[PDB]
Design a protein around this ligand. Sequence first.
Ligand code: HEM
Ligand SMILES: C[C@]12CC[C@H](O)CC1=CC[C@@H]1[C@@H]2CC[C@]2(C)C(c3cccnc3)=CC[C@@H]12
Length: 417
Amino acid sequence: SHKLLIVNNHHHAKEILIKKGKIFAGRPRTVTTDLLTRDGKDIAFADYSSTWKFHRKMVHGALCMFGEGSVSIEKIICREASSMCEVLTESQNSAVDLGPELTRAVTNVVCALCFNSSYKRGDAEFESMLQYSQGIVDTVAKDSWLQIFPNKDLTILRQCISIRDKLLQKKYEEHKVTYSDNVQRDLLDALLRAKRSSENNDVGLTEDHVLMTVGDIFGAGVETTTTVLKWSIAYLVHNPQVQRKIQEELDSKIGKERHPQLSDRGNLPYLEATIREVLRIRPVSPLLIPHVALQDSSVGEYTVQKGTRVVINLWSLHHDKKEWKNPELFDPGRFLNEEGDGLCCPSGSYLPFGAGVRVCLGEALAKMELFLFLAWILQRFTLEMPTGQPLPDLQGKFGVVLQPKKFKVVAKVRADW
Ligand code: HEM
Ligand SMILES: C[C@]12CC[C@H](O)CC1=CC[C@@H]1[C@@H]2CC[C@]2(C)C(c3cccnc3)=CC[C@@H]12
């Protein structure tokens, strides 16, 4: 038996996430989340703590400084987009599912970021990892509620968890044998280094904490960013006028003798607006992760007892007709100033990455990927539907992230390229 509070109001939501971030920083325990995270030794389901804080810090620095030398995540993202556009080119004018090829690209980013590797098309590990994440995402479809069906199976959930565990366990053991105090190749070395240094001396740096942390970054990095691109492909296809505004922005502000760079960000607010609006309209986590009162508090008038679960309904925040004119329409211009000069936050109701204390750890990285990937593609391609075939159903099932139904697009090369 457990008590629960669903928040449809943004003022309240910011009283939880921010004003009283720490009081509502607890996470909930479920048989499934416990398998996933080893009883909460990861970050995303780890109660607020010096460990939680510390690992969250490791990941921010690892990302800052991966590295190396002079070589940033930017290079790797650009590399992965270049390969995408080469795929789109041979796979060209034909109808084609961008799903799997997009997923690998996003994966090589975070695979680089965590383990200093990449996957090749067809790779057997990568394949295995698509598969097992399938089962995992599918069976964390549980309020961790329209229950009732004989369940479950968490015989298969466990099956996947282990395949994952062996994947990580191999990368862990590999990194050790080649580990060098001078260099730090990735988030794993970063933590291995941390771990050794704890031997020289109550922040938890056991093997489980290391593995679970990297697991979180390897996991989110693929399932979240990838989904958002799939939504952008959908919405782009539905709105040729948005595609075209984006393209003519790229044409004037980057040109044609050159590819987009991250330095270009602040010269392309229409694209940034477009990204924001995808994140508004099909928010990738529509419930965020739940929050748990670590002590009795209040949420303006509502009192709230220690232990109660707390679920922001970001969907309903992002679609209140009171906060958003004509929600349910895709309009990047929500997020642009009166002229188009630059950006403009049209409401306090927008918290796609969350806010305050448990805010998305990958926010920074998600935004870089999303920008480069979409910019690189739209500069060279224009995305239509096949020959004579209805626009994509935008309905979308909710696993651990809210993701769309698959479809086939036609990337036509642009008259210049
Ligand atoms: C691409 C779009 C993404 C969105 C919209 C998003 C959104 C969010 C949201 C809503 C939360 C929960 C906020 C809360 O519970 O208060 C969160 C947590 C988290 N996100 Fe993301 N995220 C995204 C991508 C990523 C990526 C790419 C990573 C890669 C490392 C990542 C790592 C995390 C982690 C570790 C947490 C847990 C933070 C904590 O509970 O302490 N996210 N994100
Ligand atoms: C289950 C899954 C995705 C399937 C992988 O096989 C394992 C995995 C690890 C961490 C989870 C992730 C889904 C997204 C999660 C739940 C989350 C997240 C969710 C949405 C936005 N940002 C972060 C942070 C931890 C992430």
